[PDB]
Design an enzyme around this catalytic site. Structure first.
Site, PDB file in Angstrom:
ATOM      1  N   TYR A   1       1.954  34.003  19.357  1.00 48.52           N
ATOM      2  CA  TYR A   1       1.648  34.978  20.385  1.00 48.52           C
ATOM      3  C   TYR A   1       0.217  34.853  20.944  1.00 48.52           C
ATOM      4  O   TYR A   1       0.068  35.045  22.157  1.00 48.52           O
ATOM      5  CB  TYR A   1       1.803  36.390  19.738  1.00 48.52           C
TER       6      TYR A   1
ATOM      7  N   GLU B   1       9.671  32.710  18.105  1.00 47.63           N
ATOM      8  CA  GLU B   1       9.265  33.873  18.805  1.00 47.63           C
ATOM      9  C   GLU B   1       8.089  33.531  19.729  1.00 47.63           C
ATOM     10  O   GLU B   1       7.181  32.804  19.319  1.00 47.63           O
ATOM     11  CB  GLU B   1       8.776  35.122  18.002  1.00 47.63           C
TER      12      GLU B   1
ATOM     13  N   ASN C   1       6.447  31.007  15.145  1.00 45.19           N
ATOM     14  CA  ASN C   1       6.171  32.091  16.089  1.00 45.19           C
ATOM     15  C   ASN C   1       4.746  31.909  16.613  1.00 45.19           C
ATOM     16  O   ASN C   1       3.846  31.609  15.852  1.00 45.19           O
ATOM     17  CB  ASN C   1       6.278  33.456  15.390  1.00 45.19           C
TER      18      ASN C   1
ATOM     19  N   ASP D   1      16.533  53.940  12.833  1.00 43.58           N
ATOM     20  CA  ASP D   1      17.792  54.595  12.504  1.00 43.58           C
ATOM     21  C   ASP D   1      18.950  54.284  13.445  1.00 43.58           C
ATOM     22  O   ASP D   1      20.079  54.061  12.957  1.00 43.58           O
ATOM     23  CB  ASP D   1      17.547  56.110  12.423  1.00 43.58           C
TER      24      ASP D   1
ATOM     25  N   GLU E   1       9.865  48.419  17.683  1.00 47.20           N
ATOM     26  CA  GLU E   1       8.778  47.488  17.359  1.00 47.20           C
ATOM     27  C   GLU E   1       8.043  47.930  16.097  1.00 47.20           C
ATOM     28  O   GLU E   1       7.554  49.083  16.013  1.00 47.20           O
ATOM     29  CB  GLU E   1       7.752  47.458  18.500  1.00 47.20           C
ATOM     30  N   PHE E   2       8.018  47.039  15.107  1.00 45.73           N
ATOM     31  CA  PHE E   2       7.327  47.337  13.868  1.00 45.73           C
ATOM     32  C   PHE E   2       5.974  47.941  14.197  1.00 45.73           C
ATOM     33  O   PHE E   2       5.253  47.332  14.999  1.00 45.73           O
ATOM     34  CB  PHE E   2       7.215  46.161  12.935  1.00 45.73           C
TER      35      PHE E   2
ATOM     36  N   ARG F   1      -1.323  31.187  14.953  1.00 41.95           N
ATOM     37  CA  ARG F   1      -2.353  31.564  15.889  1.00 41.95           C
ATOM     38  C   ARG F   1      -3.183  30.261  16.058  1.00 41.95           C
ATOM     39  O   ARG F   1      -3.251  29.499  15.103  1.00 41.95           O
ATOM     40  CB  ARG F   1      -3.344  32.642  15.449  1.00 41.95           C
TER      41      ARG F   1
ATOM     42  N   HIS G   1      10.121  56.399   6.864  1.00 45.08           N
ATOM     43  CA  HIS G   1      10.447  57.765   6.527  1.00 45.08           C
ATOM     44  C   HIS G   1       9.395  58.378   5.641  1.00 45.08           C
ATOM     45  O   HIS G   1       9.167  59.586   5.824  1.00 45.08           O
ATOM     46  CB  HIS G   1      11.854  57.712   5.893  1.00 45.08           C
TER      47      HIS G   1
ATOM     48  N   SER H   1       2.733  37.735   7.075  1.00 44.47           N
ATOM     49  CA  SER H   1       2.740  39.151   7.319  1.00 44.47           C
ATOM     50  C   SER H   1       2.977  40.142   6.187  1.00 44.47           C
ATOM     51  O   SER H   1       2.185  41.080   6.070  1.00 44.47           O
ATOM     52  CB  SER H   1       3.801  39.374   8.419  1.00 44.47           C
TER      53      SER H   1
ATOM     54  N   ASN I   1      10.933  35.537   7.516  1.00 45.22           N
ATOM     55  CA  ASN I   1      10.108  35.752   8.705  1.00 45.22           C
ATOM     56  C   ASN I   1       8.618  35.820   8.432  1.00 45.22           C
ATOM     57  O   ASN I   1       8.160  36.653   7.650  1.00 45.22           O
ATOM     58  CB  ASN I   1      10.560  36.977   9.467  1.00 45.22           C
ATOM     59  N   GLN I   2       7.819  35.108   9.225  1.00 47.39           N
ATOM     60  CA  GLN I   2       6.369  35.068   9.215  1.00 47.39           C
ATOM     61  C   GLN I   2       5.751  35.311   7.851  1.00 47.39           C
ATOM     62  O   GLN I   2       5.341  36.408   7.403  1.00 47.39           O
ATOM     63  CB  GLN I   2       5.724  36.034  10.193  1.00 47.39           C
TER      64      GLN I   2
ATOM     65  N   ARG J   1      18.345  33.792  18.135  1.00 48.50           N
ATOM     66  CA  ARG J   1      17.846  33.935  16.809  1.00 48.50           C
ATOM     67  C   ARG J   1      18.017  35.419  16.446  1.00 48.50           C
ATOM     68  O   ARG J   1      17.616  36.280  17.237  1.00 48.50           O
ATOM     69  CB  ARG J   1      16.349  33.604  16.706  1.00 48.50           C
TER      70      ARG J   1
ATOM     71  N   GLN K   1      15.334  46.004  13.674  1.00 49.91           N
ATOM     72  CA  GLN K   1      14.865  46.433  14.980  1.00 49.91           C
ATOM     73  C   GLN K   1      15.987  46.800  15.927  1.00 49.91           C
ATOM     74  O   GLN K   1      15.707  47.464  16.918  1.00 49.91           O
ATOM     75  CB  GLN K   1      13.949  45.355  15.545  1.00 49.91           C
TER      76      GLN K   1
HETATM   77  O1  LGC Z   1       6.340  38.229  15.032  1.00 49.13           O
HETATM   78  C1  LGC Z   1       6.957  39.309  15.287  1.00 49.13           C
HETATM   79  O2  LGC Z   1       6.519  39.757  16.540  1.00 49.13           O
HETATM   80  C2  LGC Z   1       7.414  40.617  17.277  1.00 49.13           C
HETATM   81  C3  LGC Z   1       6.452  41.203  18.342  1.00 49.13           C
HETATM   82  O3  LGC Z   1       5.357  41.958  17.692  1.00 49.13           O
HETATM   83  C4  LGC Z   1       8.024  41.533  16.170  1.00 49.13           C
HETATM   84  O4  LGC Z   1       8.781  42.504  16.919  1.00 49.13           O
HETATM   85  C5  LGC Z   1       8.954  40.628  15.328  1.00 49.13           C
HETATM   86  O5  LGC Z   1       9.726  41.409  14.403  1.00 49.13           O
HETATM   87  C6  LGC Z   1       8.003  39.768  14.469  1.00 49.13           C
HETATM   88  O6  LGC Z   1       8.686  38.766  13.759  1.00 49.13           O
HETATM   89 ZN    ZN Z   2      16.316  58.503   9.277  1.00 46.83          ZN
END
Ligand code: LGC
Ligand code: ZN
Ligand SMILES: *[C@@H]1O[C@H](CO)[C@@H](O[C@@H]2O[C@H](CO)[C@@H](O[C@@H]3O[C@H](CO)[C@@H](O)[C@H](O[C@H]4O[C@H](CO)[C@@H](O)[C@H](O)[C@@H]4O)[C@@H]3O[C@@H]3OC[C@@H](O)[C@H](O)[C@H]3O)[C@H](O)[C@H]2NC(C)=O)[C@H](O[C@@H]2O[C@@H](C)[C@@H](O)[C@@H](O)[C@@H]2O)[C@H]1NC(C)=O
Ligand SMILES: *[C@@H]1O[C@H](CO)[C@@H](O[C@@H]2O[C@H](CO)[C@@H](O[C@@H]3O[C@H](CO)[C@@H](O)[C@H](O[C@H]4O[C@H](CO)[C@@H](O)[C@H](O)[C@@H]4O)[C@@H]3O[C@@H]3OC[C@@H](O)[C@H](O)[C@H]3O)[C@H](O)[C@H]2NC(C)=O)[C@H](O[C@@H]2O[C@@H](C)[C@@H](O)[C@@H](O)[C@@H]2O)[C@H]1NC(C)=O
Ligand SMILES: *[C@@H]1O[C@H](CO)[C@@H](O[C@@H]2O[C@H](CO)[C@@H](O[C@@H]3O[C@H](CO)[C@@H](O)[C@H](O)[C@@H]3O[C@@H]3OC[C@@H](O)[C@H](O)[C@H]3O)[C@H](O)[C@H]2NC(C)=O)[C@H](O[C@@H]2O[C@@H](C)[C@@H](O)[C@@H](O)[C@@H]2O)[C@H]1NC(C)=O
Ligand SMILES: *[C@@H]1O[C@H](CO)[C@@H](O[C@@H]2O[C@H](CO)[C@@H](O[C@@H]3O[C@H](CO)[C@@H](O)[C@H](O)[C@@H]3O[C@@H]3OC[C@@H](O)[C@H](O)[C@H]3O)[C@H](O)[C@H]2NC(C)=O)[C@H](O[C@@H]2O[C@@H](C)[C@@H](O)[C@@H](O)[C@@H]2O)[C@H]1NC(C)=O
Ligand SMILES: *[C@@H]1O[C@H](CO)[C@@H](O[C@@H]2O[C@H](CO)[C@H](O)[C@H](O)[C@H]2NC(C)=O)[C@H](O)[C@H]1NC(C)=O
Ligand SMILES: *[C@@H]1O[C@H](CO)[C@@H](O[C@@H]2O[C@H](CO)[C@H](O)[C@H](O)[C@H]2NC(C)=O)[C@H](O)[C@H]1NC(C)=O
Ligand code: NAG
Ligand code: NAG
Ligand code: NAG
Ligand code: NAG
Ligand code: NAG
Ligand code: NAG
Ligand code: NAG
Ligand code: NAG
Ligand code: NAG
Ligand code: NAG
Ligand code: NAG
Ligand code: NAG
Ligand code: LGC
Lengths: 499, 499
Positions: free
Chosen positions: B328, B407, B326, B68, B462-463, B257, B54, B188, B184-185, B93, B37
């Site tokens: 949210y 997070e 994490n 990129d 942001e993913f 959650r 891509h 996901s 991570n998570q 982190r 990110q």
């Molecule tokens: O849980 C997440 O939430 C963040 C917010 O959506 C994301 O950017 C992080 O890469 C991810 O680990």
């Molecule tokens: Zn590229």
């Protein structure tokens, strides 16, 4: 008797004096492209040009540009066909992206049926407009997986992976495609990808460029060239043994240059000039016509030059039905030392020659080909007569091959505005001056040249330069890539084709 | 007695009422990031988030944005440290990009010493400012080579490759890094990467999304989850057996959650709510605390759920020194059918629950968390009390673990202008409301929470959303990414930290 100009001003842009009727009736005229440069990454896996341009952004171009989206010929392939139809072109040279049809590199890992369908739609649309495809299997864009598994063409594993990829292309497209090219410009990946590290994958010796991730500029270019010759030859064998029913032809692509002595009365310069022909052309043409490297390379390169086994020699010798010859310019040659023990030694120093565009008495070889803004002493100049000299040499030295000119063209600056970019009279001059000499050599020397494919159909990502130069005969606006508008060059080429 | 707000308006932004002194003196406060990110591709190999963004540009974000260049934390890592120093943060982190230190994926293929040096410089600069690193080994960015060799976490080959990568990180950085996060998570990648194909690598069943290159949404999420648990556990074993001398701790990251019944007097909804806890949290917490999957998953998923051998069960059970949680938001749960024979069946349907932010009597759970412009009925709402409920549940159900909140944060639209983006009072409200509940649960339930790391240090890719949302506590201008300017949230967090 045909007279062609060597210096500005040129008058060959008048189609009353030079046009397609000047050539034999079956001669093919068109343009060329390559997959990394035009398609975009949408719908395909990643390759070493994605890898290199992202890992080393300042080597992708001064603008850090890359092939991520480019002219989006994935979406707009029909607009490419429309350009060709407008030209009344009878040939189009494009490449298949190996990562579009076998994203995972090794065929047994599966094929991308949507990628196959993309090429099928292109091919069908070309044939429907009377355009003969000339398809390059490998225009440098190796799947990244293969480079990370075994360093791509550095390892002999490449041979079987390349063979299985080609097999797939012959199986899927060969009923419609009758002209295949194996590897684009044999000389380039070994020297630039593994020697100077200006091109992907970007390997070199540590003191040549500290940014290279690994490499050895003195040995790796020879190993990679060797494997390219073996991979090419295995694919030609496969084609001629298992796909003869398709009634097509296959060949390698060479980058050709002519070379003249820096000082044409100095024996040392003359010897450097002949060494250049052997090191530059003979490196690959030796094996392709005789199954062995040139003796000067054998002598100079010694233990660093791989040997072919008797089986390999036989596979490589004669492994072509034609040669695709790219031609852009000529250089003067003078002697230079070959410091084989220097930590910064490169394979390119083994020819014992320094190359320039200006000779000993100050003559620049011809008109400007590429301005170098960082250093003007590095400007490149062109030489129309070099295409005659190259074709004549290939007929005489290399057993009268069938030849297609697979690339020929010139850039104009990306700094020009749209109006200036459309008024590309320098391109008309470059293209007509070379075509005059090409017709002259076919008539005077009887070289078996059967088509010409100018580089490029349209503006695209240029290897090493990003979007800072333009090579298209049709203009593309980078803020909205849909259209491909014929430039003055495109418009002239249309009239040359259908006068 | 502590009182925390659940609904707007919030008053927890006043540091006279809530600040770091509210918490124990050793509690860690900071922010978090991840390598794909923030860093950019410069200096590293390619990974599956490069590949996916891509190949499938419309899944990278609505703007087709990707990692990129992003905020160029490759170049500007010192500016990240400067943000942290300005905050007086005691923790950061971040993640290591596996493709930055082992571009070719498998350690035996060589390491990138320049990549190692990048992390060494970061780590040294953090410690020099008193910031404790919390380093995530794998924040989704798997080397592309591994996905193309064997489909990454789909195959058990991932275990040894992940182990050798971790080993390298412990060897190189463990003398300075004392808090490690494995994956991570956990939830996901199996669900989004192999189920819905919203995330890399983008596999799914053909009728779930015709664009997936391959997959099976009903079976692959379980295989991938299984391998994640085994790879995590092998790495924890390696750490605790071979790097105990470093005196650090390691754990997985869970996405948590809370879940409440859509209708809290309906037994069917209540049962769906308990199923959700087991399918969402228990899928991984079961194996991590007991070496087995939850019995409801065993019963429902049947032959699609892999089994642990006795050795594997023992390796996975207890494979953590802490949990990075994490958090949210929270959802309401109601029953939904599980059509296991449908060609579009997904693993996520096995929980037999439909998830919403509005309950049966029309109550929205809390304030707006994320507006969905294509469909407003899909807006996400947050629920401050959910962090108390989650932490309490983990203490009670999962054996009183040590926990770090790894997070917690909220986005604001990328369409806002700079001034609006800096005035991010909605972020102050989100962060303070959760921190009030976190302090309350530590005091009232004695949950062993020892730090909090808000998501994100600064604006980043942001993913799934590109640059169309912003999550930073510090603003970054996409036309010139050098600076990271504290937003009102950053400024408030500075005062909360040092009141
Ligand atoms: O849980 C997440 O939430 C963040 C917010 O959506 C994301 O950017 C992080 O890469 C991810 O680990
Ligand atoms: Zn590229
Ligand atoms: C077209 O292919 C022909 C082969 O099919 C080439 O002819 C061969 O040329 C080689 C030399 O390159 C002749 O080989 C020599 O044979 C003697 C006699 O037995 C050698 O000692 C000599 O070996 C020594 O020199 C080598 C460098 O050349 C060193 O690598 C080696 O260590 C020795 O120091 C060489 O012997 C070869 O040694 C290396 C072995 O791996 C190899 O198998 C072995 O053959 C060879 O006799 C000759 N074969 C035939 C059938 O004529 C041909 O070369 C051209 O023509 C010959 C007459 C010479 O003039 C070459 O200099 C010239 O290149 C080549 N044609 C082209 C145009 O390249
Ligand atoms: C913590 O880990 C404990 C294991 O270390 C769990 O206890 C084990 O729970 C299993 C059931 O999940 C009990 O196994 C049963 O043993 C009988 C008696 O011999 C079985 O037939 C039953 O097998 C049948 O049901 C399975 C679905 O459960 C099917 O997969 C299988 O095909 C049969 O149809 C099951 O036997 C197992 O069968 C599958 C084999 O692969 C496996 O090795 C075999 O054991 C098991 O006896 C019990 N072990 C002990 C030592 O108690 C524990 O489960 C919790 O507690 C037990 C008492 C039950 O209440 C579980 O429902 C509940 O989950 C788990 N704890 C947590 C909280 O998950
Ligand atoms: C094209 O290459 C030719 C062949 O090499 C160049 O001609 C040669 O140029 C040499 C000077 O670089 C001449 O040698 C010199 O001769 C003078 C007069 O006697 C003498 O004083 C010198 O010191 C020098 O002599 C050499 O010194 C080194 C010794 O190892 C060697 O044996 C000596 O020869 C040489 O005579 C001349 N050869 C011929 C056949 O003419 C040619 O150079 C250009 O023309 C010559 C005539 C001269 O005017 C150079 O100044 C002029 O550059 C070179 N052409 C160009 C354009 O570079
Ligand atoms: C929260 O969930 C509860 C428990 O499910 C909902 O209460 C239930 O709501 C049902 C209606 O959806 C009630 O059943 C109906 O009863 C009327 C009156 O006798 C009858 O005419 C119906 O046709 C229907 O009866 C069912 O028909 C299907 C049969 O299979 C079944 O056996 C019958 O029961 C049910 O009585 C009621 N249960 C209780 C314990 O109150 C609750 O629904 C909300 O409150 C109820 C009182 C009613 O006013 C609903 O309109 C209202 O939506 C649901 N809460 C929400 C907010 O959805
Ligand atoms: C390139 O690879 C060549 C051959 O492996 C190295 O050249 C060799 O150097 C080793 C160590 O000196 C040997 O001693 C050889 O005599 C010499 N072999 C030959 C065939 O030249 C070369 O050092 C290495 N280049 C770099 C920059 O790594
Ligand atoms: C997902 O993979 C599962 C298991 O391989 C496939 O489900 C199976 O379907 C085959 C063919 O019908 C079998 O007959 C099995 O009864 C059934 N197995 C189980 C465990 O459910 C499923 O069809 C495939 N999904 C897709 C979309 O490819
Ligand atoms: C084409 O060029 C030839 C000379 O090569 C000329 O004689 C002929 O008239 C030209 N054709 C047209 C249509 O202008
Ligand atoms: C370009 O990038 C490389 C790193 O890939 C670095 O070695 C070099 O300093 C940069 N070149 C210039 C001229 O800045
Ligand atoms: C020809 O194809 C056949 C059938 O697949 C195979 O047996 C043979 O090895 C192939 N190869 C070449 C290059 O001849
Ligand atoms: C190394 O090569 C560079 C270019 O090849 C050259 O300028 C330099 O003189 C060489 N240095 C040594 C020590 O040979
Ligand atoms: C861009 O170019 C295409 C072709 O000219 C045109 O039709 C389209 O409207 C243009 N798009 C924008 C956004 O200007
Ligand atoms: C296309 O070229 C053919 C062959 O020379 C010619 O007969 C035909 O008129 C040309 N079409 C156009 C529109 O120029
Ligand atoms: C911090 O918050 C506490 C209540 O938790 C309050 O009593 C204390 O005065 C505040 N500290 C400062 C410096 O405002
Ligand atoms: C997005 O891209 C995929 C190809 O990757 C294609 O299937 C789909 O039509 C596109 N989605 C939309 C909504 O256009
Ligand atoms: C521990 O490291 C030693 C030495 O490299 C090795 O023999 C052993 O297999 C390692 N592994 C684990 C996970 O214990
Ligand atoms: C397939 O699933 C989609 C979403 O999961 C749903 O809208 C549709 O009804 C399902 N169709 C069938 C045939 O089950
Ligand atoms: C961009 O931002 C940096 C930091 O504010 C600034 O110093 C630099 O001058 C700016 N660059 C441009 C081109 O505006
Ligand atoms: C940093 O935090 C420490 C510990 O609470 C505090 O004593 C120090 O004054 C703070 N520094 C600043 C500049 O806020
Ligand atoms: O020879 C080439 O020259 C062209 C012009 O430099 C380049 O764009 C093609 O990809 C290449 O094959």
């Amino acid at each position: 008797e045909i007279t062609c100009q060597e210096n500005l001003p040129f008058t060959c842009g008048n189609t009353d004096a030079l046009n397609s009727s000047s050539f034999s009736s079956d001669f093919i005229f068109g343009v060329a492209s390559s997959a990394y440069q035009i398609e975009g990454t949408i719908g395909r896996g990643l390759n070493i040009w994605d890898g290199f341009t992202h890992r080393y952004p300042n080597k992708s171009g001064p603008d850090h540009g890359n092939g991520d989206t480019t002219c989006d010929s994935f979406s707009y392939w029909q607009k490419d066909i429309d350009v060709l139809d407008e030209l009344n072109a009878t040939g189009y040279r494009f490449s298949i992206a190996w990562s579009r049809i076998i994203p995972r590199g090794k065929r047994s890992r599966g094929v991308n049926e949507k990628g196959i369908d993309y090429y099928h739609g292109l091919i069908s649309g070309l044939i429907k407009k009377g355009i003969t495809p000339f398809v390059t299997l490998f225009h440098w864009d190796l799947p990244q997986t293969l480079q990370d598994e075994y360093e791509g063409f550095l390892d002999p594993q490449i041979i079987d992976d390349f063979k299985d990829y080609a097999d797939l292309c012959f199986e899927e497209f060969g009923d419609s495609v009758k002209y295949w090219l194996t590897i684009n410009q044999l000389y380039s990946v070994p020297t630039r990808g593994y020697g100077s590290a200006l091109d992907a994958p970007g390997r070199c010796s540590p003191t040549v460029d500290p940014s290279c991730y690994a490499g050895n500029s003195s040995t790796e270019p020879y190993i990679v060239a060797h494997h390219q010759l073996l991979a090419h030859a295995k694919v030609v064998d496969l084609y001629r043994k298992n796909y003869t029913h398709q009634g097509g032809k296959i060949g390698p692509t060479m980058i050709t240059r002519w070379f003249l002595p820096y000082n044409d009365t100095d024996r040392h310069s003359i010897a450097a000039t002949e060494r250049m022909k052997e090191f530059f052309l003979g490196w690959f043409m030796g094996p392709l016509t005789n199954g062995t490297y040139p003796q000067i390379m054998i002598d100079t390169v010694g233990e660093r030059l791989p040997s072919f086994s008797p089986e390999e020699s036989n596979l490589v010798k004669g492994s072509y039905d034609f040669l695709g010859l790219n031609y852009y310019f000529t250089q003067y040659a003078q002697p230079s030392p070959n410091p084989v023990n220097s930590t910064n030694h490169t394979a390119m120093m083994d020819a014992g020659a320094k190359l320039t565009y200006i000779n000993a008495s100050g003559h620049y070889i011809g008109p400007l080909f590429e301005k170098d803004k960082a250093d003007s002493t590095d400007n490149i100049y062109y030489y129309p007569k070099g295409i005659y000299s190259v074709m004549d040499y290939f007929k005489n030295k290399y057993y009268n091959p069938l030849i297609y000119v697979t690339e020929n063209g010139i850039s104009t600056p990306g700094d020009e505005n749209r109006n200036q970019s459309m008024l590309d009279y320098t391109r008309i001059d470059y293209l007509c001056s070379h075509l005059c000499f090409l017709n002259k050599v076919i008539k005077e020397k009887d070289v078996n040249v059967k088509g010409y494919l100018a580089w490029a159909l349209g503006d695209n990502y240029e290897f090493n330069k990003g979007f800072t130069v333009r090579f298209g005969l049709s203009y593309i606006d980078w803020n909205n890539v849909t259209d491909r508008d014929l430039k003055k060059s495109g418009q002239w080429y249309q009239s040359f084709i259908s006068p």
